[PDB]
Amino acid sequence: ITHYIDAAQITIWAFWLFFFGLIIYLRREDKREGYPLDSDRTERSGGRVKVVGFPDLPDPKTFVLPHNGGTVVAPRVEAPVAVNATPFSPAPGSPLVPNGDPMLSGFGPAASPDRPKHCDLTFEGLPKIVPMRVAKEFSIAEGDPDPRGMTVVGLDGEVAGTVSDVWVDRSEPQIRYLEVEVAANKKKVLLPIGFSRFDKKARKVKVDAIKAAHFANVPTLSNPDQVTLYEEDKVCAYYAGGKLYATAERAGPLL
Amino acid sequence: PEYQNIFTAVQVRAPAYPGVPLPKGNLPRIGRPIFSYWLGKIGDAQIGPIYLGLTGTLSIFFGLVAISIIGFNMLASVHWDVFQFLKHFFWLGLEPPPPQYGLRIPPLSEGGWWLMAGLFLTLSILLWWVRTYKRAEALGMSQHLSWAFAAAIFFYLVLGFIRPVMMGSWAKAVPFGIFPHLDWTAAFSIRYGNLYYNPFHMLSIAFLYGSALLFAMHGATILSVSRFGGDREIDQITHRGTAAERAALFWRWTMGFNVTMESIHRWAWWCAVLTVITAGIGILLSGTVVDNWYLWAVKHGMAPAYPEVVTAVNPYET
Amino acid sequence: AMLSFEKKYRVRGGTLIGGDLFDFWVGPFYVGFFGVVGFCFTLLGVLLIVWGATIGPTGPTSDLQTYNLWRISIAPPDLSYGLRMAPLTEGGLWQIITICAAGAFISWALREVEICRKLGIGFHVPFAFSFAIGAYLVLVFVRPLLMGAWGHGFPYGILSHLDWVSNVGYQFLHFHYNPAHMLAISFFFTNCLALSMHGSLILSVTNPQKGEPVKTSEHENTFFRDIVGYSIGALAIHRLGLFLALSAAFWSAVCILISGPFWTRGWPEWWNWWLELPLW
Amino acid sequence: CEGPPPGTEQIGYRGVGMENYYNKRQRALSIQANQPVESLPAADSTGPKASEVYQNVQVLKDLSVGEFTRTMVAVTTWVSPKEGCNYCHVPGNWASDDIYTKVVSRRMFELVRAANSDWKAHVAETGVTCYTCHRGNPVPKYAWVTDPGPKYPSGLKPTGQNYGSKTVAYASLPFDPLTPFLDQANEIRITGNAALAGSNPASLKQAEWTFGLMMNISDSLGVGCTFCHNTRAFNDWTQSTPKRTTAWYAIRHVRDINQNYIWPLNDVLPASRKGPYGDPLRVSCMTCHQAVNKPLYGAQMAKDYPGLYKT
Amino acid sequence: TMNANLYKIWLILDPRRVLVSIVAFQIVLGLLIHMIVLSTDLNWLDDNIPVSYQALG
Amino acid sequence: TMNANLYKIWLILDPRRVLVSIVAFQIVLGLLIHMIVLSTDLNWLDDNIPVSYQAL
Amino acid sequence: TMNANLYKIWLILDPRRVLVSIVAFQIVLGLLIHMIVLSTDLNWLDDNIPVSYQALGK
Amino acid sequence: NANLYKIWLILDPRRVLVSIVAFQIVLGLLIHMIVLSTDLNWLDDNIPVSYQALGK
Ligand SMILES: CCCCCCCCCCCCCCCCCC(=O)OC[C@H](COP(=O)([O-])OCC(O)COP(=O)([O-])OC[C@@H](COC(=O)CCCCCCCCCCCCCCCCC)OC(=O)CCCCCCCCCCCCCCCCC)OC(=O)CCCCCCCCCCCCCCCCC
Ligand code: BCL
Ligand code: BCL
Ligand SMILES: CC[C@H]1c2cc3[nH]c4c(c3C)C(=O)[C@H](C(=O)OC)c4c3nc(cc4[nH]c(cc(n2)[C@@H]1C)c(C(C)=O)c4C)[C@@H](C)[C@@H]3CCC(=O)OC/C=C(/C)CCC[C@H](C)CCC[C@H](C)CCCC(C)C
Ligand SMILES: CC[C@H]1c2cc3[nH]c4c(c3C)C(=O)[C@H](C(=O)OC)c4c3nc(cc4[nH]c(cc(n2)[C@@H]1C)c(C(C)=O)c4C)[C@@H](C)[C@@H]3CCC(=O)OC/C=C(\C)CCC[C@H](C)CCC[C@H](C)CCCC(C)C
Ligand SMILES: COC(C)(C)C/C=C/C(C)=C/C=C/C(C)=C/C=C/C(C)=C/C=C\C=C(C)\C=C\C=C(C)\C=C\C=C(C)\C=C\CC(C)(C)OC
Ligand SMILES: [Ca+2]
Ligand SMILES: [Ca+2]
Ligand SMILES: [Ca+2]
Ligand SMILES: [Ca+2]
Ligand SMILES: [Ca+2]
Ligand SMILES: [Fe+3]
């Protein structure tokens, strides 16, 4: 006989039911960081009103860290952290302007969270990211230049210093930072590989992010032979601030 | 200018990693690892070692038999003439049994080799599935890969096994060959009245496109924050860094919402898996439930209508 | 509203055009100059699509006008109009919507560039999005231009554009044999495998078996070395995924760009250069 | 590789994508390669009929002697210009049928007359001459025989496919669709007429044979599928072009030519005119069309020869 | 003629891997040989011996 | 004609890898040869010798 | 006419890497040449010489 | 030229040998395959006799 309902139509409707359930599942997972939202509705409600949208936040999950590193929970209540900036306009949706010298403000592309003050570890439990002085089993791959001894230049072509060592990932072998002995103050600062272009024939490392004189203020390591997560983010964020702050033209606009 | 983190400019080397130790009962790994400088320009320079126990050994044996049965028949189909085998390679194939044999085991001379290649590739794949499960178990990892692999195996099984059995004939399965399996794809759509109007075909396309959309988005996002260590997603997930924060804000500011460093991989996981889930269902319903997808789409009110600017007299009516 | 960590990133400047004039957010969305411009192109295009649905192909009173979501179709002009502008009711509406879409798409990408400048992040995402835009522009601009009529563009209809794809494909008898098309599909398929592999591995090491700690980079490398004897690496897997997705888009554009402008016969017959080589 | 711009033609409604593309330079050289031989001057149509002047005229009975002679001159240029009259005639005896080419040619006259008079649903008023197929060659360049395909070892049955074959326009589809469909009359339709399964036993392998035939048809006329189909519904006559109706009759026309005109000549044709299976060189779409949508780009040759029509 | 020091082969090839590879090889060979013969005149399942059971219905 | 110092080849080529490769090559070669012969007139399985076993 | 110092070739090329390559090449060339010959009139398997063994059973 | 021997001061003797050996084998295979594709084919030319005919 004939029927309007058929199995293809039944099954496709069943898929939509599954799919929309999946979307709500995924949107719940998406809210394990950064939520509840910082709004002006939560300010005026005296905190009574938490902005979370739909769906609401999931029940917290736990991450068990190896080597007795502790437990991470998600979502989590995070203490508000002051913003080192003042609004360009008091109207909602206005940007803010960094206080003081922008490079040193910790705001905008110079900003970063406060990551943990411990070192990422290898499976065996050693500090993962270390200089080649310490991980003596590492070498430069034949065919490529040794960055040690290369000259570090800033965005304006001025000599910022010399590469004094190379910091490698012991878990998954690669250069993560160059160690730069800064000419101006003889301090040794990290330089992320993400901000480094090699000019191999010149044996020069070019850093477009900052000027030569900006190298004096790269955040410094508490311990010269290892790097904490906290210090990794502070280092990378300082170079990144230069992308917007290091010269006047970088503010924009084009027209 | 800036470093884009596409190629590794300066590779470093260390003695090869033998791998995380596995529990008792796993076999020792085999192979002496080597380094490729050129693989090391785009990714990891180490090749090897590899694990190979009974599951993978049985899998590879089934798989080599299956692949050789295919190639042998291809070479036989140009009468052992190796030059004509190279000339015609993309056209050659191993053809399913004729429809007259139904689901019975067909003769060696006319379809038996296809059924054997199909049986042993299928067993080879099923054993490879177990391999993906066991390698995660030995490392203490969850089974996300084997779940996604099962979804691909489902689609594979529907194409060559489930649907042909449902339809009562190995002749409705897929031939083994490059261009021959493209013929099968086009002929399947023709026979079943235009696969574009199969709604699970439409969904499967949405998810295949979405996989490229999502990996372009995610791939590009991570490289742009790799300057902040964003490629190290384990510690960005447990200890959110400015990499994970800047990534979410790029997307939040672009399109109004965002996910997390962990949950993008869930979006990615489901998008890819649903590509082959919907594909299996679409093929599973073709011939078994719906014989003409266009007329099925007409029936449910979906097919567009156009002004008539061409038309043809049906000579079967006259 | 803002993410609980967002306020410290909402910095002034980094615009390409506009400066202080449009430098503000609207809820989560950043606007800026290309936000304003893109919004106008988008709302116009969407409203003109709905107007085309309202009047249909032959007027709102005909039986062909429909708001059925699968059946709504706004079509390009007849090929006889060449590279000229057709009347609004004879495909010109499609032509204006196309320009809105291109303007909407390009404005979206440039807005993304301004966002990257604010966040001090790389420009990979707008660069990658440019490949999708390029493919759209190959479809509605370059390929129609090389063949001499905007009417070679595809219609804007959820199912009607599949009819366009179908009939354009079968103009070449057996479109599956397009070499750039085969290559592009290989990239589309390989991308999907790679995406499922990547998603699975990250979820499986951060969500290990009960009682297990979070797994390590060493687990990730070991895991695929154990299965396939090779691990590309956690950075390189993101390199690979971007390469596969962009390659799929690029060869898509190539495969349709050569279908008409650079090849007019069946696609299987293209392979006769191989068959006719003096080796066999 | 080809260079833009191509020639283009719109076939269907705007945006449906039914469009034809061709290379302008190849079209110009094809037009040069499909020139029609200029028709002979008209002859006096008076005097006695050929039926009463000559001794063994069985087909061209009602032509005047002038129109009959004119026809013999024409067929010589169309079929055997290098050899001349004696390609079909015993020297010194025009009436004798004791040479195989004359016996064949007599049936060819009936073939053409049947085509020009009875198959206008196909050949319209344009019609065909000997030249349409022969092109100045006794043996048509684009005749065909059943194709045995590549050699197999004795313990493996040939598949009839999965091979690079020009006959299906270099697809790996079943590479001999001519024998089952343009000689024999196997069913070409496979698309179902109901949405839901239950009443269509056609098979995927039948779809591949049909698809292979359509490559050959398309390739023989130099067109894409959209010349005759809207490919969102290949089976739907209401969305097809009138060329599909024409193609339907042409398939039956081709079947009539091979079964009733060519095949009965097999025993009198020399072995050189036969394929490995003993079958005679015979007729497909390519034989007349020769990669043009109309033979000779639609040149009207038959109309200047009254002897090329029935009664 | 077997060699008296043949046992020293297990000083060369790993006994466990040999065992694993033989088991794997023989499972494949067993399935492969059964299937080849089923695709020939020797087939014992569809030979209607001792009877055809599809005809009793 | 063989050399008296031919045993020194095991100072050059690893005995372990050579043995594994030999049995792998011989097993694959033997499968291949059985395949070739079955696909020819020499087929001993489908030759109906001593009898055809497919009864009506 | 070979050179007296030709043995010095094993000072330049690794004898081990050379021996494995020759074995692999010779195996493949042997397989390749056998197949080419089988594809021609020279076929010694399907030539029904001395007799055709399938006729014996059909 | 008298100083041509210095070419081995510029180009690695070991890779050049390997490249020459690799190139010559492929070329030899290529040329045989080309000639066997033409009228010059000496294998399927039924010369001195057709052996398949000998078996019919
Ligand atoms: C013929 C078939 C041939 C197949 C051949 C295959 C060959 C292999 C054969 C062997 C197979 C063995 C299978 C596994 C064995 C045991 C594995 C194991 O370790 O188990 C313990 C395992 C681990 O325990 P655990 O403590 O959770 O550990 C998790 C980790 O800590 C870490 O976990 P986590 O934190 O990552 O979370 C896990 C994850 C869980 O995800 C998975 O693990 C499974 C993923 C799915 C795979 C299958 C695809 C499903 C396709 C559905 C679409 C079909 C269309 C029709 C729709 C019908 C549904 C209505 O969480 C989610 O993703 C949540 C998903 C929510 C589902 C969607 C949400 C909406 C549901 C409906 C909403 C309400 C509807 C109305 C709403 C109204 C308002 C809108 O137990 C689980 O809880 C996970 C279950 C997964 C295993 C079984 C399912 C996957 C494997 C089979 C897939 C087969 C695909 C074929 C589909 C065919 C077409 C339909
Ligand atoms: C009509 C064509 C002829 C024929 C013509 C030839 C000719 C001509 C030759 C062969 C040779 C060989 N043939 Mg044949 N061959 C025929 C039919 C067959 C059939 C078959 C099922 O019908 C088989 C399985 C074989 C098999 C073989 C191999 C034994 C050998 C090549 C091995 C190789 O490449 O080593 C490569 C591996 C290495 C170089 C590594 C080092 C060698 C090791 C140390 C020794 C291995 C065993 C050795 C090959 C023994 C050869 C002994 C006899 C002379 C056969 N022939 C038919 C009847 N065959 C070749 C041969 O005899 O070579 C000496 C050869 O020149
Ligand atoms: C007209 C058709 C002729 C014919 C015409 C020719 C001609 C002409 C030539 C060959 C050449 C070759 N032919 Mg032929 N050939 C025919 C039939 C055959 C058949 C066959 C199954 O019918 C086979 C297998 C071969 C095989 C071969 C090789 C022996 C040789 C290519 C070696 C090479 O590439 O070295 C490349 C590798 C290297 C240079 C590496 C360095 C040295 C190596 C390590 C030592 C190799 C030893 C060498 C092969 C010894 C053989 C010399 C003999 C005089 C044959 N010929 C027919 C009968 N053939 C070539 C030749 O004789 O070369 C001297 C050549 O120029
Ligand atoms: C989300 C859907 C997508 C998807 C998912 C998917 N596929 C998967 C997985 C997942 C999650 C796996 O875990 C699995 C895998 O292991 O990937 C790393 C797999 C896989 N997907 C594969 C392919 C694949 N996936 C495809 C598609 C897709 N996969 C999707 C689009 C396709 C397409 C597009 O058609 C292909 C071709 C394989 C790479 C792998 C399954 C491998 C497998 O089953 O292997 C056993 C089979 C064999 C034939 C083994 C043969 C052995 C080889 C010939 C090696 C020979 C070795 C020998 C020792 C050499 C000795 C010689 C000496 C001389 C040295
Ligand atoms: C290049 C590899 C792949 C890719 C990557 C890519 N796409 C991207 C990005 C990247 C990197 C973004 O950053 C960007 C984004 O922000 O995503 C969330 C985007 C995006 N890719 C999108 C879509 C998408 N990408 C696709 C494909 C692909 N994108 C690739 C295969 C497709 C396919 C295959 O069809 C679509 C559907 C959007 C989600 C988003 C861009 C959003 C945007 O530009 O918003 C402004 C425009 C509107 C809101 C609508 C404009 C309306 C028009 C004015 C009128 C409509 C005209 C239209 C032509 C009609 C079409 C009708 C019918 C066809 C149904
Ligand atoms: C001579 O060659 C040598 C030996 C040198 C090696 C060379 C090999 C080569 C070149 C091989 C080339 C292979 C190629 C090009 C293969 C291409 C394959 C493609 C594109 C395949 C695509 C799709 C195929 C599919 C989807 C097939 C699916 C089939 C299935 C699932 C069949 C299952 C059958 C089963 C489970 C049978 C069971 C038997 C039962 C139990 C029913 O018995 C009664
Ligand atoms: Ca086929
Ligand atoms: Ca029995
Ligand atoms: Ca026997
Ligand atoms: Ca013999
Ligand atoms: Ca010869
Ligand atoms: Fe990732």
UniProtKB/TrEMBL annotation, chain A:
Alphabetized UniProt keyword annotations: Membrane, Transmembrane, Transmembrane helix
Listed transmembrane segments: 8-26
Keyword Transmembrane helix: yes
Single GO cellular component term: plasma membrane light-harvesting complex
Coiled coil spans: none
Gene Ontology biological-process annotations: photosynthesis, light reaction
Photosynthetic reaction centre H subunit N-terminal domain mapped to chain residues: 1-134
PRC-barrel domain ranges (all copies): 144-212
SUPFAM superfamilies, per the entry: Photosystem II reaction centre subunit H, transmembrane region (SSF81490), PRC-barrel domain (SSF50346)
Record keyword Transmembrane present: yes
UniProt-listed InterPro entries: Bac_photo_RC_H_C, Photo_RC_H, Photo_RC_H_N, Photo_RC_H_N_sf, PRC-brl_dom, PRC_barrel-like_sf
Pfam families on file: PRC (PF05239), PRCH (PF03967)
Name by which UniProt lists this protein: Photosynthetic reaction center H subunit
Organism: Thermochromatium tepidum
From TrEMBL, chain B:
BP GO terms, sorted: photosynthetic electron transport in photosystem II
Binding-site residues for Fe(3+), renumbered to this chain: 218, 233, 265
Membrane-spanning residues: 50-76, 113-133, 145-166, 200-223, 267-290
Keywords: Bacteriochlorophyll, Calcium, Chlorophyll, Chromophore, Electron transport, Iron, Magnesium, Membrane, Metal-binding, Photosynthesis, Reaction center, Transmembrane, Transmembrane helix, Transport
Sequence positions that bind Ca(2+): 95
A GO cellular-component term linked to this record: endomembrane system
Annotated bacteriochlorophyll a 1 binding sites: 196, 201
Residues that coordinate or bind bacteriochlorophyll a 4: 196, 201
Membrane topology (UniProt): Multi-pass membrane protein
Binding-site positions, bacteriochlorophyll a 3: 181
InterPro entries: Photo_II_D1/D2_sf (IPR036854), Photo_RC_L/M (IPR000484), Photo_RC_L/M_CS (IPR055265), Photo_RC_M (IPR005781)
Binding site for bacteriochlorophyll a 2: 196, 201
Binding-site list for bacteriopheophytin a: 128
GO molecular function, one term: bacteriochlorophyll binding
Role according to the record: The reaction center is a membrane-bound complex that mediates the initial photochemical event in the electron transfer process of photosynthesis.
Protein name: Reaction center protein M chain
From TrEMBL, chain E:
Gene: pufA
Record-linked PROSITE patterns: ANTENNA_COMP_ALPHA
Function according to Swiss-Prot or TrEMBL: Antenna complexes are light-harvesting systems, which transfer the excitation energy to the reaction centers.
InterPro entries (alphabetical): Antenna_a/b (IPR000066), Antenna_alpha (IPR018332), Antenna_alpha_CS (IPR002361), Light-harvesting_complex (IPR035889)
Source organism superkingdom: Bacteria
Protein name as it appears in the record: LH1 alpha polypeptide
Cellular component GO terms held in the UniProt record: organelle inner membrane; plasma membrane; plasma membrane light-harvesting complex
Residues engaged in binding bacteriochlorophyll a 1: 34, 44
Binding site residues for Ca(2+): 44, 47-49
From TrEMBL, chain G:
Any matching Pfam family: LHC
Superkingdom of the organism of origin: Bacteria
Natural source organism: Thermochromatium tepidum
Presence of the UniProt keyword Transmembrane helix in the record: yes
Membrane protein topology class: Single-pass type II membrane protein
Residue positions binding Ca(2+): 44, 47-49
Protein's cellular compartments: Cell membrane
GO cellular component, one term: organelle inner membrane
Membrane-crossing segments per the record: 18-37
Purpose of the protein: Antenna complexes are light-harvesting systems, which transfer the excitation energy to the reaction centers.
Any GO molecular function: metal ion binding
Chain residues that bind bacteriochlorophyll a 1: 34, 44
Main location: membrane
Name of the protein in question: LH1 alpha polypeptide
